[PDB]
Amino acid sequence: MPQALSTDILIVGGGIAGLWLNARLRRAGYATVLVESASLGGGQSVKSQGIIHGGTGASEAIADMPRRWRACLGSDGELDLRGVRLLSEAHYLWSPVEQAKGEDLPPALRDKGFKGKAYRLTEIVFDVPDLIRRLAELAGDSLLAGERIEPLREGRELAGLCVDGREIRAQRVVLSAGAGNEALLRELGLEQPAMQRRPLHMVMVKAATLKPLYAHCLGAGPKPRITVTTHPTRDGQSVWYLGGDIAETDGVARDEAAQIAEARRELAKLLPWIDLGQAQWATLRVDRAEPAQSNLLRPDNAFLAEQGRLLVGWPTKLALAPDFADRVCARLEEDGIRPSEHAALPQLPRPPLAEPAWEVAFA
Ligand SMILES: Cc1cc2nc3c(=O)[nH]c(=O)nc-3n(C[C@H](O)[C@H](O)[C@H](O)COP(=O)(O)OP(=O)(O)OC[C@H]3O[C@@H](n4cnc5c(N)ncnc54)[C@H](O)[C@@H]3O)c2cc1C
Ligand SMILES: [Hg+2]
């Protein structure tokens, strides 16, 4: 028998949404346990491009995100993320806000061959592994590696969970397990809220010759043709990580070589002044985990649902993790749930941190 535990809020899943919420709750005086079955940040989060989007009824929530995340890096934000690494102070639009010129242009667009125009946004780009590291620090002793989860009932009521045979009692249980939310819901005998999986086929290029770039390339059409972010590697090279429309439906249908070949064509057109002849190339397939369209959604918002003492959801964007936290805290607030008194947590087995794919795919 492992030592039984007691807290206020028990969170399942240590990606950005669970970790951010955990940090908010602890800051507000709640006791928590956060349960992760693999590595923290290791589903979608560390695989994101790290861009904090900010672009109004439903669309209000997203618009305020860059300001909110920025605040956290200083003295007066909703979390203490001071000393978290930004990859870039700005993300850019790139066409054929501020119009950027001369040495205000991103390094990769300073070339004389750069025709067309770039626009600087308030949007920010975070080093996600370093973000996750800090949120794990803010978690303190709440963090628990646990693989196998069962419900802990009191009649029909959900009193907590049994994690690797350990009973953990809690006033609420929150499922922030990404793609794992579906099977956890089934484990509780639930089928709502339903989940969808929208795959991406992301491309990574690694070379010594790359110059920093954080941008959506627009042709015609609302959506980015490609989305570039630059990621430094431990050995002193960089990696350009490519999302956008190249990583969507037709990218998904292309195999690795066809997807790489498509990526080479497009970089030769858009950034011909950067020699990729010595570059290494890889791709990455990953599913976005979202509420199904069959749920009651507001689009540019986090999604949350509940059944009894169970709260469950998805941020939809990494950007919107603070909105996911707000939605949980307003339920707690409306329901009158306050911090109670609990024994200190013992020593617990701790989940590992995830590495970014650019360190694993080449190194
Ligand atoms: C390629 C890509 C690029 C993206 N780029 C951006 C971007 O630039 N900007 C932006 O705002 N958003 C972006 N997103 C969206 C963003 O990544 C997600 O919305 C967000 O990271 C999801 O956070 P999460 O914590 O809900 O999910 P996850 O990060 O998937 O975390 C879920 C966690 O739960 C754990 N878990 C699963 N099952 C169980 C279980 N049974 N028991 C215990 N733990 C479990 C997992 O191991 C995982 O760590 C991107 C997504 C992808 C796929
Ligand atoms: Hg472009």
Side-chain angles (χ1 to χ4, degrees):
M1 175 173 56
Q3 189 181 318
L5 306 188
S6 165
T7 46
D8 300 318
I9 294 96
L10 174 51
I11 316 304
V12 180
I16 192 81
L19 279 171
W20 186 287
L21 171 65
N22 191 48
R24 285 275 295 282
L25 288 175
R26 288 182 82 69
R27 197 183 168 127
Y30 286 77
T32 62
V33 170
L34 191 163
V35 178
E36 163 71 58
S37 55
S39 61
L40 303 164
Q44 300 164 85
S45 295
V46 176
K47 300 180 176 86
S48 63
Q49 294 202 262
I51 295 157
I52 290 152
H53 305 289
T56 189
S59 209
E60 214 144 66
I62 193 69
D64 203 54
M65 285 306 108
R67 183 191 64 78
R68 287 182 64 184
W69 287 74
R70 176 84 68 182
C72 300
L73 296 182
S75 37
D76 201 22
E78 73 198 65
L79 290 179
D80 194 353
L81 306 186
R82 279 170 309 188
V84 176
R85 268 191 70 176
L86 294 188
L87 292 178
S88 187
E89 299 251 45
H91 183 80
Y92 293 74
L93 308 179
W94 168 24
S95 276
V97 320
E98 251 213 316
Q99 206 218 6
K101 264 138 164 176
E103 320 290 81
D104 286 77
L105 289 156
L109 302 178
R110 270 161 207 165
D111 200 82
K112 309 205 80 69
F114 182 52
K115 308 173 79 47
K117 21 191 68 163
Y119 303 76
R120 178 182 207 215
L121 305 166
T122 61
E123 300 186 358
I124 316 160
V125 186
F126 265 74
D127 177 10
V128 179
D130 195 57
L131 171 60
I132 280 143
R133 159 209 60 87
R134 187 48 183 168
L135 296 167
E137 276 161 4
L138 292 173
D141 53 312
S142 64
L143 297 178
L144 175 63
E147 279 187 356
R148 191 194 135 171
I149 293 166
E150 295 103 82
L152 186 60
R153 301 281 182 197
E154 273 165 24
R156 302 305 191 76
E157 218 212 67
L158 185 68
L161 308 161
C162 191
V163 180
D164 306 330
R166 188 195 299 263
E167 97 194 298
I168 303 183
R169 294 187 128 71
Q171 306 193 61
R172 293 292 188 269
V173 179
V174 186
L175 309 184
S176 55
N181 280 348
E182 188 175 57
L184 287 162
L185 292 169
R186 263 165 225 148
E187 263 307 290
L188 299 152
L190 302 174
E191 301 197 47
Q192 293 316 127
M195 193 177 78
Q196 63 175 2
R197 283 185 221 247
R198 288 160 66 231
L200 282 168
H201 200 176
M202 302 299 287
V203 183
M204 292 173 287
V205 200
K206 181 165 177 189
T209 57
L210 309 180
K211 299 203 181 87
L213 179 54
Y214 305 84
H216 302 303
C217 174
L218 309 162
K223 300 228 172 168
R225 186 145 157 86
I226 65 162
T227 289
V228 187
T229 48
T230 303
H231 309 268
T233 53
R234 274 178 237 104
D235 65 23
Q237 294 191 8
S238 309
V239 177
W240 277 345
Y241 193 30
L242 315 182
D245 185 80
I246 198 191
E248 289 279 0
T249 302
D250 300 310
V252 172
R254 292 187 284 266
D255 55 83
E256 188 183 31
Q259 181 68 334
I260 283 158
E262 181 63 33
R264 291 181 192 270
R265 281 191 298 277
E266 288 268 281
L267 293 170
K269 293 208 216 180
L270 300 180
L271 295 163
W273 46 91
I274 304 298
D275 194 349
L276 299 176
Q278 302 247 67
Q280 298 170 272
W281 299 86
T283 81
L284 176 71
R285 317 194 83 114
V286 54
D287 288 336
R288 290 162 288 189
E290 295 170 1
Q293 304 307 322
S294 72
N295 304 292
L296 190 47
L297 276 72
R298 285 183 167 196
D300 303 316
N301 298 262
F303 174 92
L304 187 58
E306 39 178 326
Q307 169 81 67
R309 328 218 309 180
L310 181 77
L311 288 158
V312 51
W314 297 274
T316 74
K317 275 157 174 216
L318 177 133
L320 283 170
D323 185 66
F324 177 79
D326 295 333
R327 275 144 183 275
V328 169
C329 290
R331 289 268 78 241
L332 300 177
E333 168 44 44
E334 184 165 8
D335 278 4
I337 301 298
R338 307 290 153 197
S340 178
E341 215 64 71
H342 307 282
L345 295 165
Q347 299 282 245
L348 297 173
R350 306 195 103 237
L353 294 169
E355 300 195 65
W358 32 101
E359 296 293 344
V360 185
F362 308 107

mmCIF file of all heavy atoms in Angstrom, residues 94-96 216-219 225 270, ligand 2:
data_model
loop_
_atom_site.group_PDB
_atom_site.id
_atom_site.type_symbol
_atom_site.label_atom_id
_atom_site.label_comp_id
_atom_site.label_asym_id
_atom_site.label_seq_id
_atom_site.Cartn_x
_atom_site.Cartn_y
_atom_site.Cartn_z
ATOM 1 N N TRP A 94 4.998 38.275 -43.422
ATOM 2 C CA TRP A 94 5.956 38.309 -44.511
ATOM 3 C C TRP A 94 5.179 38.142 -45.819
ATOM 4 O O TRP A 94 4.596 37.089 -46.073
ATOM 5 C CB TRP A 94 6.967 37.208 -44.231
ATOM 6 C CG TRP A 94 7.896 36.817 -45.284
ATOM 7 C CD1 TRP A 94 8.326 37.546 -46.360
ATOM 8 C CD2 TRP A 94 8.588 35.567 -45.331
ATOM 9 N NE1 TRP A 94 9.221 36.795 -47.086
ATOM 10 C CE2 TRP A 94 9.409 35.586 -46.458
ATOM 11 C CE3 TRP A 94 8.554 34.413 -44.537
ATOM 12 C CZ2 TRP A 94 10.195 34.507 -46.810
ATOM 13 C CZ3 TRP A 94 9.341 33.335 -44.890
ATOM 14 C CH2 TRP A 94 10.148 33.390 -46.012
ATOM 15 N N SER A 95 5.148 39.224 -46.602
ATOM 16 C CA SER A 95 4.243 39.393 -47.751
ATOM 17 C C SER A 95 5.059 39.559 -49.037
ATOM 18 O O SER A 95 6.274 39.792 -48.962
ATOM 19 C CB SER A 95 3.342 40.633 -47.547
ATOM 20 O OG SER A 95 2.194 40.346 -46.749
ATOM 21 N N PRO A 96 4.407 39.410 -50.219
ATOM 22 C CA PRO A 96 5.110 39.722 -51.469
ATOM 23 C C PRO A 96 4.615 41.038 -52.093
ATOM 24 O O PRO A 96 4.025 41.870 -51.395
ATOM 25 C CB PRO A 96 4.774 38.508 -52.359
ATOM 26 C CG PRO A 96 3.533 37.884 -51.747
ATOM 27 C CD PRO A 96 3.154 38.690 -50.522
ATOM 28 N N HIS A 216 5.128 34.230 -40.395
ATOM 29 C CA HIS A 216 4.120 33.635 -41.271
ATOM 30 C C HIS A 216 4.356 34.183 -42.694
ATOM 31 O O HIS A 216 4.351 35.395 -42.860
ATOM 32 C CB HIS A 216 2.719 34.053 -40.856
ATOM 33 C CG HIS A 216 2.345 33.699 -39.454
ATOM 34 N ND1 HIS A 216 2.367 32.407 -38.968
ATOM 35 C CD2 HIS A 216 1.846 34.465 -38.455
ATOM 36 C CE1 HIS A 216 1.943 32.403 -37.716
ATOM 37 N NE2 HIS A 216 1.634 33.643 -37.379
ATOM 38 N N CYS A 217 4.575 33.313 -43.690
ATOM 39 C CA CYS A 217 4.643 33.737 -45.106
ATOM 40 C C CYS A 217 3.243 33.694 -45.659
ATOM 41 O O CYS A 217 2.618 32.645 -45.691
ATOM 42 C CB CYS A 217 5.571 32.873 -45.998
ATOM 43 S SG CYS A 217 5.509 33.298 -47.790
ATOM 44 N N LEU A 218 2.750 34.845 -46.071
ATOM 45 C CA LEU A 218 1.492 34.918 -46.780
ATOM 46 C C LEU A 218 1.765 35.017 -48.269
ATOM 47 O O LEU A 218 2.640 35.779 -48.724
ATOM 48 C CB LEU A 218 0.700 36.137 -46.337
ATOM 49 C CG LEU A 218 0.538 36.257 -44.830
ATOM 50 C CD1 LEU A 218 0.156 37.683 -44.444
ATOM 51 C CD2 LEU A 218 -0.481 35.236 -44.324
ATOM 52 N N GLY A 219 1.023 34.213 -49.018
ATOM 53 C CA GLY A 219 0.721 34.522 -50.404
ATOM 54 C C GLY A 219 -0.661 35.143 -50.351
ATOM 55 O O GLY A 219 -0.955 35.971 -49.470
ATOM 56 N N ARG A 225 1.153 30.312 -45.730
ATOM 57 C CA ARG A 225 1.710 29.340 -46.683
ATOM 58 C C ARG A 225 2.691 28.425 -45.923
ATOM 59 O O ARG A 225 2.553 27.197 -45.930
ATOM 60 C CB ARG A 225 2.407 30.134 -47.814
ATOM 61 C CG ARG A 225 2.967 29.381 -49.024
ATOM 62 C CD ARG A 225 2.800 30.236 -50.308
ATOM 63 N NE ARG A 225 3.718 29.928 -51.420
ATOM 64 C CZ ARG A 225 3.544 28.983 -52.367
ATOM 65 N NH1 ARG A 225 2.472 28.169 -52.369
ATOM 66 N NH2 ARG A 225 4.481 28.840 -53.325
ATOM 67 N N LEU A 270 11.631 31.268 -51.388
ATOM 68 C CA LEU A 270 11.364 32.299 -50.428
ATOM 69 C C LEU A 270 12.616 32.880 -49.798
ATOM 70 O O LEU A 270 12.618 34.050 -49.459
ATOM 71 C CB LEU A 270 10.432 31.744 -49.324
ATOM 72 C CG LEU A 270 9.065 31.239 -49.827
ATOM 73 C CD1 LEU A 270 8.228 30.725 -48.653
ATOM 74 C CD2 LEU A 270 8.275 32.282 -50.599
HETATM 75 HG HG HG B 2 6.115 34.867 -48.492
#
